[PDB]
Design a protein around this ligand. Structure first.
Ligand SMILES: [Ca+2]
Ligand SMILES: [Ca+2]
Ligand SMILES: [Ca+2]
Ligand SMILES: [Ca+2]
Ligand SMILES: [Ca+2]
Ligand SMILES: [Ca+2]
Ligand SMILES: [Ca+2]
Ligand SMILES: [Ca+2]
Ligand SMILES: [Ca+2]
Ligand SMILES: [Ca+2]
Lengths: 636, 636
């Protein structure tokens, strides 16, 4: 700030001056009469400036004091103002100053070291703070930040450092006291520890704390954790303030002399798209799925990934590893860690995120009502993210979250729960886009899109399911002699059908025109909101049929619902018509993908997953590498 | 948006094209073989564009259709694509188009007439919507917007107009349907009425509505009201959407064809500073205050103001008209109306805002817990606003709200309730500033500041209470012979004191140094946050003393706590030392104010108000003229 010191010949004045502060002088209020002019003389550690030698005694004239260094003792710097006039002997007003240094410091340049406002972008400022939502404590099943103690030294690596740096005379804190505080509004969102061993000084219970500080040169280290992610009621800033109080008069209340602040922004939860290199894969084991599990095991091994499996005792028969969770991350200059977003779906895999995923350097977060009020659209096969894109100038360097919705709300429409929606939006940095998925029986955007790395263009392709393309392929085969070829060749317990009867079935053709249409609507929506061109998009041949409530399901295994482990795709096995020794569906897919350097492996998921209304993507999950681009450098 | 139509020689295609929309053509997907080139021919109402005569049949080549006018009948515009090759006779693919107009319209230019996003500023766009928080209904004591009916025609003037403008063939709605909707997230915040007489189509109960629209040319008028002010969980935007659905296939679900939206911003509650021309004044009548009431009556009459009084039967002895309410306004292009913010203080004047102020063209709003959890800092003598100012470039054309707080939170500090704080901030346009007032026993910023019109500089002065200035004045008088002069001259039942004993009382001098200090701290705070210079500020001579919990009270009537009715000030009567026939306090004040064209009237409030810990400003309230500057033209 800036202080105004009023000087009088009546008696001398005593004041404290914090370094970095503007101190000004009121010379005229009490300038004695007889008097027409003034002079200022000061000790060597005080710099004096005068705008608008000696000067006329006029109120518009400005006098500023600056101190070069901290005082060694109370009052060791002096200012002497000399008032004089025509026939008037000089009279002197004295000012005794004590200079001190109070610096509250944090990593405001976002460089992992330490020594106003929060601003976004690469030319911006303000420190970052992580929610302490992992469990480094190897004992209990609580997030570290739910209690008031630092129980491991490792826990500190998740915390942000703030240092208070003081330089005062040795007895300065006889008569002054420092208090560190946070607004009541924000105390339930942060916890601060003093390092001495660590002790809580601010938190949900305490909004202010008197600091114990010795005179002279001192440095005090604090460790800060956040306890809440940005959300609809929390923009994500936390301000911590230091105040210096004069406690000199034993009769009177303490008087504020100086305040300074640092502003932290809480790190958002961020997702990783399929174009980010994989690191660990998840699945269930259940009745008769060893074969599915080996193809996945193989593909992991090829993509250099840890693998992780959830045995059927923990599963409670729940095979949809995709739906109960989404693995994202949080990121600060000093620490990056994965964090699992746990869907309130809460079916058999309910405990997997709490017990098995959350842990040392693995964060946890959840939203929505846990015991009801849910829909299928809250399952995280309905939550995806695009690769980085730029839309008409505006960069989305972390992509844009995509999630499925209805086209308008009715008695029969579904939506992802508002709390989930509001959370995703409040993260800001992946500006969510609503797509139309409620036309699908299950209702997940993973049932009609996926993304894959590409060596050229923007670095990926969007893949969309396409009846159009499956009709064209089948028509071409009939034209070229193979109308007799059988869909579902390789499956007993199942009624095969020939290309000619598929092409001539008019109901099926109607149902797929309606689906082509729901999907074309998203096509354009994605084109507008991700700035895609047709050459970013590849159509996968895929038929659907309509069923209960005229909702869409896959007619054969939904190939777009694939596992993407870098260049190694785990695509559902369509069991197409076998022509010249190969399924023409597999051949068609391979011909669209292999020129992008992609390897397609067709995994059989038919009786295990497909007849249960999901495929390979729905049966699995992937942790992937965080973006290199730093979220705080975006300007959302 | 933008649609993509796929053409085939297989059979003809039928599509609807909304005017204002980009329609593109996929020529290559189903282009027959033999074929190398194409030509397009269309009817006269279709404009065809082709980037990247006849053309090579190559997917990168772009074809766009535009329609000039609405169709008179289904399929009355045609497009014919001709595929041909080296030795290949032309084959034709047909496209039959129906053009229609769907325009959802609102006052997006903010000009009171009608015929994307919401953007601030004078070069911005987006319609405004008022909260319907008055009571034009002369019957009940409910806000108009609490029910689902328009019970007066006058009520409609508070509402915003939206018009749906359609142009279609006569049978178009045989096979298509229009639905108007709002997100579930925002349905509890808006109500929409169809004009036919008015019937509710959207609201807290209903998020979508099938519209009944005739083919041909039609115009349908809707009336919209908001039900909630911007707040911490509501940024203040409301989006209303129209969707066109194809209902042609009786077997299949409806298919979205077109959506458009309008975005409304809800008008914020805005305060008026003392520098705005007054229009109506408020007070109580109680035991023995007729004399106070006549001086106010006089001053009103001089300032051309309605006057309004609350008799003691309604009062329940509560005299502090200032504290229970604050009169602001809301403002849209079509309608401006005052609105009372009712403090949850809830003392004797509890009913006055509900019954007596709220009414025809008088709005109502309230916040905070009504039956407890309050402090004195929630009384609206602790809520003020500055005049317009510009702070280091940034304009605050409506001023900045100011409210008192503690310097940091402790077991003994008070604050204005968070809900009140959060409301004020969410209004955005008067970016509140926190001042330090908790050092006062009552704790209101009106106890130490006020603002007054000035003919020069920035158009006002800030007035601050000043012990410094009262010591200087009293000292000057003692110096000039009048040390014997008696403070409280004119008051029996009261112990007079002489200037010499006042000047020499050291405790009193200490207490006032502590007060000088609390006030100097705000001085600088105001200087920084309102960009004020010393020449904007005038010090009023005022002494204090400390009492219970070392909290400050006024030693004589607090003159800064005045009623400002344009150039006519109602200043508390200090009862100063009478020197050369006049109170030197009155004379000093008059000498600082009269050169600004201000008329000072000193009203005696001593036994009525002052000994009850408040003055003239605390006993009264004022409605004032809304700013001329339009809030939506600010860029907060
Ligand atoms: Ca802990
Ligand atoms: Ca931790
Ligand atoms: Ca769960
Ligand atoms: Ca950790
Ligand atoms: Ca997912
Ligand atoms: Ca009504
Ligand atoms: Ca009304
Ligand atoms: Ca009230
Ligand atoms: Ca009205
Ligand atoms: Ca007020």
């Amino acid at each position: 700030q800036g202080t105004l010191i009023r000087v009088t010949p009546e008696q001398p004045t005593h004041a404290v001056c914090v370094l970095g502060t503007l101190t000004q002088l009121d010379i005229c209020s009490s300038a004695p009469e007889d008097c027409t002019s003034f002079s200022i003389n000061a000790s060597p550690g005080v710099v004096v400036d005068i705008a608008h030698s000696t000067w006329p005694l006029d109120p518009g004239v400005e006098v500023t004091l600056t101190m070069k260094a901290a005082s060694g003792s109370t009052g060791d710097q002096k200012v002497q103002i000399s008032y004089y006039g025509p026939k008037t002997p000089p009279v002197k007003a004295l000012l005794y100053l004590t200079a001190v240094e109070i610096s509250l410091c944090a990593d405001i340049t976002r460089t992992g070291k330490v020594k106003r406002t929060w601003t976004w972008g690469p030319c911006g400022q303000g420190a970052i703070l992580l929610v302490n939502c992992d469990r480094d404590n190897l004992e209990s099943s609580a997030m570290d930040c739910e209690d008031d103690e630092v129980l491991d030294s490792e826990d500190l690596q998740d915390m942000s450092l703030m240092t208070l740096s003081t330089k005062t005379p040795k007895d300065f804190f006889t008569n002054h006291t420092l208090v560190l505080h946070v607004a009541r509004s924000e105390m339930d969102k942060v916890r601060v520890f003093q390092a001495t061993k660590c002790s809580v000084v601010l938190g949900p219970k305490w909004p202010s704390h008197y600091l114990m500080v010795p005179g002279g040169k001192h440095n005090m280290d604090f460790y800060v954790e956040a306890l809440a992610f940005p959300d609809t009621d929390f923009p994500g800033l936390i301000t911590l303030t230091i105040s210096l109080l004069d406690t000199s008069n034993l009769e009177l209340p303490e008087a504020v002399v100086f305040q300074d602040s640092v502003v932290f922004r809480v790190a958002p939860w961020i997702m990783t798209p399929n174009t980010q290199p994989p690191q660990e894969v998840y699945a269930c084991s259940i009745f008769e799925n060893e074969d599915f599990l080996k193809s996945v095991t193989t593909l992991a091994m090829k993509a250099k990934c840890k693998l992780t499996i959830c045995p059927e005792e923990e599963n409670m028969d729940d095979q949809w590893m995709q739906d109960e969770m989404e693995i994202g991350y949080i990121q600060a200059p000093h620490k990056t860690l994965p964090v699992v977003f746990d869907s309130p779906r809460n079916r058999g895999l309910k405990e997997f995120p709490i017990k098995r995923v959350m842990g040392p350097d693995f964060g946890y977060v959840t939203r929505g009502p846990q015991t009801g009020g849910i829909s299928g659209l809250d399952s995280f096969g309905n939550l995806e993210v695009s690769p980085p894109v730029t839309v008409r100038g505006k960069e989305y360097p972390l992509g844009r979250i995509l999630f499925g919705d209805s086209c308008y709300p009715s008695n029969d429409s579904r939506q992802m729960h508002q709390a989930l929606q509001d959370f995703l939006s409040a993260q800001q940095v992946q500006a969510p886009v609503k797509l139309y998925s409620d036309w699908l029986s299950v209702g997940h955007v993973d049932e009609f899109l996926s993304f894959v790395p590409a060596p050229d263009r923007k670095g990926f392709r969007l893949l969309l399911a396409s009846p159009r393309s499956c009709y064209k392929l089948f028509q071409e085969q009939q034209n070229e002699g193979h109308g007799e070829a059988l869909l579902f060749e390789g499956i007993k317990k199942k009624k095969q059908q020939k290309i000619k009867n598929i092409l001539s079935n008019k109901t099926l053709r109607e149902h797929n025109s309606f689906v082509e249409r729901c999907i074309d609507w998203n096509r354009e929506l994605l084109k507008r909101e991700l700035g895609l061109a047709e050459s970013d998009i590849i159509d996968i041949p895929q038929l659907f049929k309509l069923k209960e409530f005229s909702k869409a399901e896959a007619f054969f295994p939904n190939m777009v619902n694939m596992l993407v482990l870098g260049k190694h795709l785990g695509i559902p096995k369509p069991f197409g018509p076998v022509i010249n020794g190969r399924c023409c569906l597999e051949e068609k897919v391979c011909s669209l993908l292999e020129p992008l350097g992609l390897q397609c492996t067709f995994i059989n998921d038919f009786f295990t997953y497909h007849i249960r209304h999901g495929e390979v993507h729905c049966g699995t999950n992937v942790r992937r590498k965080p973006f290199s681009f730093k979220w705080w450098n975006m300007v959302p």
